[PDB]
Amino acid sequence: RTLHMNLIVAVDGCGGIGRNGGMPWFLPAEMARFAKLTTLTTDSGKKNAVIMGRKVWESIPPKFRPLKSRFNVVLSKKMKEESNENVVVARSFESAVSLLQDMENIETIWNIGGREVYELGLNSPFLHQMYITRVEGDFLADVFFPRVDYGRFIKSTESEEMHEEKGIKYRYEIYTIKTDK
Numbered sequence: 001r002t003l004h005m006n007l008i009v010a011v012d013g014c015g016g017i018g019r020n021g022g023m024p025w026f027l028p029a030e031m032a033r034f035a036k037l038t039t040l041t042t043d044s045g046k047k048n049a050v051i052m053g054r055k056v057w058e059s060i061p062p063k064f065r066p067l068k069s070r071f072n073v074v075l076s077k078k079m080k081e082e083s084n085e086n087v088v089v090a091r092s093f094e095s096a097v098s099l100l101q102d103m104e105n106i107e108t109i110w111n112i113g114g115r116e117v118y119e120l121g122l123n124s125p126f127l128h129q130m131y132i133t134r135v136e137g138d139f140l141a142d143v144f145f146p147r148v149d150y151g152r153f154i155k156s157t158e159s160e161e162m163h164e165e166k167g168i169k170y171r172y173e174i175y176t177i178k179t180d181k
């Protein structure tokens with residue numbers, strides 16, 4: 001085998017995710033949870049995969065650019081091939097998903113996004129869960145999360161407190177596709 005593609009995103013009050021090619025906020029604790037959720041595997045020795053658009057890859061600091069302990073797939077029609085063994089450039093979403101499903105040591109595909117990547121994942125058969133961090137307020141984003149029918153999902157009822165860093169408040173949400181749930 002089973003292979004799950006889980007989308008992971010942090011949206012503001014207007015569903016915005018990005019502003020001026022970068023993120024509208026800095027939340028170290030939320031980013032630490034992101035790294036944990038996208039890195040940990042039930043079977044050690046197996047790895048997780050992160051599939052991202054070109055602009056997300058460019059928004060990752062070059063010192064951390066190949067996301068450690070995770071196999072990196074970058075969708076791009078323009079970038080040259082990446083010589084690194086942990087990064088691979090895929091020219092289409094279907095080819096990227098096929099390449100990931102071929103690799104046996106990949107446990108879970110974490111769609112970390114870009115709007116087009118989020119939409120493609122939302123239409124993928126491997127779609128399992130959405131891990132949505134809902135941030136309060138309007139950060140005047142220029143790039144947004146795709147429109148999505150939450151009626152396709154079941155919202156997990158675990159107790160979710162409010163979190164706050166640097167006066168920025170947010171809360172975690174987990175949705176599971178109704179086909180699986």
Ligand SMILES: NC(=O)c1ccc[n+]([C@@H]2O[C@H](COP(=O)([O-])OP(=O)(O)OC[C@H]3O[C@@H](n4cnc5c(N)ncnc54)[C@H](OP(=O)(O)O)[C@@H]3O)[C@@H](O)[C@H]2O)c1
Pocket residue numbers: 008009010011016017018019020021022023052053054055056057059075076077078079090091092093112113114115116117120143
């Ligand atoms: N808050 C969050 O959780 C969050 C998450 C992700 C991103 N963001 C923000 O949002 C922005 C990045 O997202 P974005 O939507 O602007 O861009 P993106 O999807 O990250 O990157 C777009 C690029 O990816 C490539 N691409 C996408 N789908 C493809 C496909 N099916 N086949 C081939 N190539 C494909 C193309 O590369 P070429 O241009 O080379 O063809 C395209 O121009 C930044 O502002 C970032 O900080 C925020």
Ligand SMILES: Nc1nc(=O)c2c(Cc3ccc(C(=O)Nc4ccccc4C(=O)O)cc3)c[nH]c2[nH]1
Pocket residue numbers: 008009010023030031032034035056059060061064067068112113133
């Ligand atoms: N929720 C949610 N938040 C996001 O920021 C986001 C992004 C963009 C992004 C994704 C990852 C990083 C990054 O390098 N992060 C880390 C930070 C500290 C320690 C380790 C890591 C690591 O992963 O190694 C930065 C930016 C895509 N999708 C997202 N979803």
